[PDB]
Design a protein around this ligand. Structure first.
Ligand SMILES: Cc1cc2nc3c(=O)[nH]c(=O)nc-3n(C[C@H](O)[C@H](O)[C@H](O)COP(=O)(O)OP(=O)(O)OC[C@H]3O[C@@H](n4cnc5c(N)ncnc54)[C@H](O)[C@@H]3O)c2cc1C
Ligand SMILES: Cc1cc2nc3c(=O)[nH]c(=O)nc-3n(C[C@H](O)[C@H](O)[C@H](O)COP(=O)(O)OP(=O)(O)OC[C@H]3O[C@@H](n4cnc5c(N)ncnc54)[C@H](O)[C@@H]3O)c2cc1C
Ligand SMILES: Cc1cc2nc3c(=O)[nH]c(=O)nc-3n(C[C@H](O)[C@H](O)[C@H](O)COP(=O)(O)OP(=O)(O)OC[C@H]3O[C@@H](n4cnc5c(N)ncnc54)[C@H](O)[C@@H]3O)c2cc1C
Ligand SMILES: Cc1cc2nc3c(=O)[nH]c(=O)nc-3n(C[C@H](O)[C@H](O)[C@H](O)COP(=O)(O)OP(=O)(O)OC[C@H]3O[C@@H](n4cnc5c(N)ncnc54)[C@H](O)[C@@H]3O)c2cc1C
Ligand SMILES: O=c1ccn([C@H]2C[C@H](O)[C@@H](COP(=O)(O)O)O2)c(=O)[nH]1
Ligand SMILES: O=c1ccn([C@H]2C[C@H](O)[C@@H](COP(=O)(O)O)O2)c(=O)[nH]1
Ligand SMILES: O=c1ccn([C@H]2C[C@H](O)[C@@H](COP(=O)(O)O)O2)c(=O)[nH]1
Ligand SMILES: O=c1ccn([C@H]2C[C@H](O)[C@@H](COP(=O)(O)O)O2)c(=O)[nH]1
Lengths: 218, 217, 215, 213
């Protein structure tokens, strides 16, 4: 399961633990009970979601593999209730891969410069920066220093392990028009995968708990 | 569902697991823009990570356990905040007649003025009386959340525990150790057995390089 | 600041870092009453909660074990508690007042329920002392003690996590006993962070009882 | 307390809750100097770290983004940072001194490396301002800015997590730039919590640079 994002980004599902019934099981222990049947168990998921009983959803866990620009990753990595491992500019020579916005990204803004020219100006500056980076590397400057000239639109890659409760918090905050458009796009892909693996939890989340605006439209 | 019986009526049961040793290798390798290699180099990397304290890659391995334990043991266990819990409620459920009664051998090493068998019996008596009072209060219309306050700390409870391998290693350091109470040591031994089974390379490296306790040897 | 709770409990404020302006400063990233108080309301009403993490409290709490077990489920906080392994425990137990059963039709008078709870704690405690006196280690002897035994702990918590605690514990769905503790925590919070507390009540608080009971 | 770091950075102490005795109080659940200091050592030596969570600091830090990205990986803490979405960003970038590289054999003089870094930041910043001036929203315009751009943040952290930070950042394996920040954090920690700091160095600190300063 892999969804392409932006010009060179992606969100890929690496692994998952549990499913909707993992949450049902965890909730039912309060009452000294276990699973029942489809109708009552699905009903329980809705009940939990509607009354803010969120801890049972911590027992569903995902691992994603994400390729995203650094400015997006910086926003994403603010979610502390999660696990991350990322590509290092200290330890790796970084690839020529940068997020160049499409002209349509500037739709809705009156600019004194054509959108195509904005695109071009972003490209020029990344090209120069990357060339400088390689030059510094070639001349013996350690990578950890050479990379400081690279722009925030450089692509990075990381593993993200997150449980369904924290993932819902992420969707609330990132699948939302107040978040930057670029991370909205990533959050939509996260939502798609979530919905696929946990359809009852996802549906109940949208119906009762989701606070953002865009998932109910798309 | 691996299941290990603990104490007189307790258990630790494995409910689910995500990932394995290679999940940690994969997560660590991304720093170098790399993925998996081969058995020798990958196993070597696990040892390397363990010996240098690079622990974040082990967070991508996750377990869900189902545990039945006495409340005094659960109170110690639930101090591990880097984990997820859901537990049986004395507010919402009528609690069962199940208590941890120590065996006489539990007092081995202690000189007691009362035979160990008699200590066992005294503990039994007091739980029996407390439980009887609990039922009586319930039967008379006292809400469960109040009636249960007379029940002793050796009452068995049950919970689900979801925990990643990093936090699980911290748990083993602290609970699989002679300074911890004997009862939780027993639970920690079972958690270690399951961990070793699911993550043999991580477990072996952990024991060699990082494990701080004294009983897992 | 110390507030008595239940028959022998209390919540005591031990220390605090910061005040309403600590949140303002963090939201602004810097260093009028009207503009700063307005910002606190703004943050609260839009769910910008991270700035309130820079206000921190340390409480000292004496509470029964069943209450502490509920309280200690709040993982975004710091705790240190008295030990039954390392200390001889005191004869102190929460005995409900008869009024605790008001609203419930019991086949036994409420005063008799009170008595029955007392008896059983007295017998359990006596058994505990007998076991200790006979050479049984404390960590085993204490397992016969009931859940209403008082314990004590230090609790260090920031204002964001504290607000989550008030949402869940200062609420009629929570057990009455912990509601009482939550009311005291609210009173201290309101005293130290009046603007944050007021804004919280108006815009973010999800519970029911802090709107029903003053302070 | 404010310590300058790198060419334009700093670490400033904003607030603190508690002191060494806050940890002693918590471990005891309650001043005798010798016994209380001895308890701090005892806790440190046996890995009883939770009592140090009751000491808390708030710092105000100015650092380059590549340093902040490393720092912000410490999840057991609180952060609020300047936004490139909401603010026009200032012309402030970390330009390494020539001495940062002297000790690496480079085919280009260190002074020329410095100059090449400066040129590229200057061009990037100019492009940024141009895009802003032409009506491109800030959140997009800023994506051309390099990783050595300075940012500012508040950091609230307890002594236990702060010790973990010192273990990992006040250490030669960490990038030199964040080592410099960690040294300043250590200085402020030592000043406010001398007993904890001394016991930490003696029994628990795993890094290599703080015993040399
Ligand atoms: C539109 C928008 C604008 C933003 N602007 C800025 C900005 O200008 N500057 C900036 O610095 N950040 C900004 N952020 C980031 C924001 O402040 C949060 O850091 C981020 O959204 C992650 O949210 P979180 O803390 O809920 O998630 P997590 O860090 O994953 O925490 C999840 C939940 O756990 C709890 N939690 C975890 N750790 C703690 C703790 N230490 N104390 C108390 N509770 C805790 C909270 O209940 C939290 O909701 C912005 C975010 C959005 C969506
Ligand atoms: C022999 C023994 C005796 C004990 N005696 C007592 C006692 O008398 N009283 C008592 O109250 N407790 C006692 N404890 C419990 C102990 O203080 C810890 O609460 C418990 O061992 C959990 O450890 P932890 O904090 O490492 O685990 P977790 O809470 O799971 O944390 C895992 C790791 O995350 C980090 N972490 C998590 N949250 C925070 C935070 N808020 N700040 C900083 N770092 C954080 C730490 O690095 C920690 O190691 C005892 C434990 C043992 C083993
Ligand atoms: C009326 C009532 C009845 C209850 N009944 C039961 C019951 O029957 N059984 C039972 O076990 N518990 C029960 N609880 C406890 C409840 O499930 C929570 O454990 C408790 O209320 C603490 O809430 P919290 O998780 O938000 O707090 P904290 O644990 O302090 O966490 C604070 C916030 O940080 C985030 N967070 C922290 N850690 C994680 C994580 N690992 N993953 C995702 N997010 C995280 C969440 O956003 C959370 O809201 C009950 C609580 C109430 C109020
Ligand atoms: C020299 C060096 C090189 C590095 N290289 C890389 C790299 O190439 N790629 C990369 O991604 N990162 C890298 N890091 C970052 C590193 O992996 C850690 O993210 C960072 O050091 C913070 O450590 P922490 O998790 O101990 O701190 P915190 O995140 O503040 O956690 C504090 C403690 O709390 C506990 N804890 C908190 N959250 C959890 C959780 N979810 N599960 C289990 N335990 C938890 C642990 O006990 C931990 O030690 C590097 C760090 C160093 C020092
Ligand atoms: O929408 C936002 C805005 C800010 N931040 C956090 C991320 C960075 O740590 C810091 C600055 O972000 P920018 O606004 O520059 O992207 O605040 C977010 O997480 N999301
Ligand atoms: O109102 C509640 C009910 C339960 N729990 C948690 C605490 C325990 O870990 C477990 C059982 O508590 P009781 O329902 O028995 O109090 O669930 C709470 O935090 N609050
Ligand atoms: O070995 C111990 C001793 C204490 N505690 C914690 C659990 C409780 O929160 C408190 C007291 O537990 P007892 O010492 O009573 O078991 O301190 C532990 O986690 N492990
Ligand atoms: O010494 C390091 C190396 C890496 N990282 C983390 C920070 C980023 O999330 C990611 C890559 O950072 P760089 O190696 O590119 O600085 O790993 C650190 O925290 N410290």
């Amino acid at each position: 399961m892999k969804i392409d994002i932006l010009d060179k980004g992606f969100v890929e599902l690496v692994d998952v633990m549990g499913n909707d019934l993992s949450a049902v099981r965890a909730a039912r222990v309060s009452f000294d009970m276990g699973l029942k049947d489809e109708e009552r168990d699905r009903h329980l998921i809705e009940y939990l979601m509607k009354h803010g009983h969120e801890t049972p959803f911590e027992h569903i866990v995902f691992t994603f593999h994400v390729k995203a620009p650094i400015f997006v990753a910086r926003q994403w990595f603010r979610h502390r209730i999660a696990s991350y491992n990322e590509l290092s500019g200290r330890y790796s020579k970084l690839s020529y891969e940068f997020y160049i916005p499409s002209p349509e990204r500037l739709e809705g803004y009156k600019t004194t410069i054509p959108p195509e020219r904005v695109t071009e100006k972003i490209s020029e500056i990344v090209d120069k920066a990357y060339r400088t980076y390689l030059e510094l590397i070639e001349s013996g400057v350690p990578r950890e220093v050479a990379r400081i000239v690279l722009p925030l639109n450089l692509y990075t890659r990381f593993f993200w392990t997150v449980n369904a409760r924290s993932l819902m918090n992420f969707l609330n905050l990132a699948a939302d028009s107040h978040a930057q458009w670029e991370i909205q796009q990533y959050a939509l892909a996260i939502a798609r995968i979530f919905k696929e693996k946990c359809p009852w939890t996802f549906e109940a989340f949208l119906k009762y708990a989701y606070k953002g605006d865009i998932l109910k439209e798309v």
